[PDB]
Structure 1
């Protein structure tokens, strides 16, 4: 007997159920990767033998998202077209592993000030049964993990 309320406490979480909160809206995505926390390394050696190893300064995350092309309005083109030499609406990204109903967060990866740097077109092929998938890559400053 494992009594599935205990599965919701001590079993791990899969990666197929996630909600992406993009600014103040929810946008359905297919994939999401690159929400890393990376530091640099400071080193210092003297002649006596002391090696000093230290964390450096953390560098920027590069988050890539991908969703399909729908017949309506393209919300990801409208956010990468509004670039005027510096000026982009930064957004808060929230990617939360959710329950199957979609109403409560298991664990979330938060992203502070993201702006788009690329947007790839789908690969058009007359001999392929696939869905047109755009892939946007984002650049931010901080990745935060809230667990609840």
Structure 2
């Protein structure tokens, strides 16, 4: 007997159920990767033998998202087209592993000030049964993990 309320406490979480909160809206995505926390390394050696190893300064995350092409309005083109030499609406990204109903967060990866740097077109092929998938890559400053 494992009594599935205990599965919701001590079993791990899969990666197929996630909600992406993009600014103040929810946008359905297919994939999401690159929400890393990376530091640099400071090193210092003297002649006596002391090696000093230290964390450097953390560098920027590069988050890539991908969703399909729908017949309506393209919300990801409208956010990468509004670039005027510096000026982009930064957004808060929230990617939360959710329950199957979609109403409560298991664990979330938060992203502070993201703006788009690329947007790839789908690969058009007359001999392929696939869905048109755009892939946007984002650049931010901080990745935060809230667990609840």
Say whether the fold is shared (TM-score over 0.5): yes
Tell me how far 1:36 sits from its aligned partner.
0.0
The residue aligned with 2:72 is 72
Task: Provide the secondary structure at the position in 1 that maps to 2:79.
Answer: helix
Tell me how far 1:99 sits from its aligned partner.
0.0
The residue aligned with 1:129 is 129
**Structure 2 residues without counterparts, runs of 5 or longer:** none
Partners of 2:16 and 2:141 lie apart in 1 by 26
Task: Provide the secondary structure at the position in 2 that maps to 1:79.
Answer: helix
Task: Provide the secondary structure at the position in 1 that maps to 2:59.
Answer: coil
Tell me how far 1:132 sits from its aligned partner.
0.0
Partners of 2:46 and 2:60 lie apart in 1 by 31
Partners of 1:65 and 1:35 lie apart in 2 by 10
- How many residues align? The count is 148
Task: Provide the secondary structure at the position in 1 that maps to 2:73.
Answer: coil
Partners of 2:79 and 2:58 lie apart in 1 by 27
Partners of 1:122 and 1:40 lie apart in 2 by 35
The residue aligned with 2:115 is 115
What does the per-residue CA deviation read over 1:46-81, in whole Å, with 9 as the maximum and x for residues that have no partner? 000000000000000000000000000000000000
Tell me how far 1:87 sits from its aligned partner.
0.0
Deviation beyond 3 Å, 4+ runs, structure 1: none
Partners of 2:147 and 2:20 lie apart in 1 by 16
Using the size of structure 1 for normalisation, the TM-score is 1.00
Tell me how far 1:94 sits from its aligned partner.
0.0
**Structure 1 residues without counterparts, runs of 5 or longer:** none
Partners of 2:117 and 2:134 lie apart in 1 by 13
- RMSD of aligned C-alpha atoms? 0.0
Using the size of structure 2 for normalisation, the TM-score is 1.00
Tell me how far 1:112 sits from its aligned partner.
0.0
What does the per-residue CA deviation read over 1:84-127, in whole Å, with 9 as the maximum and x for residues that have no partner? 00000000000000000000000000000000000000000000
Tell me how far 1:42 sits from its aligned partner.
0.0
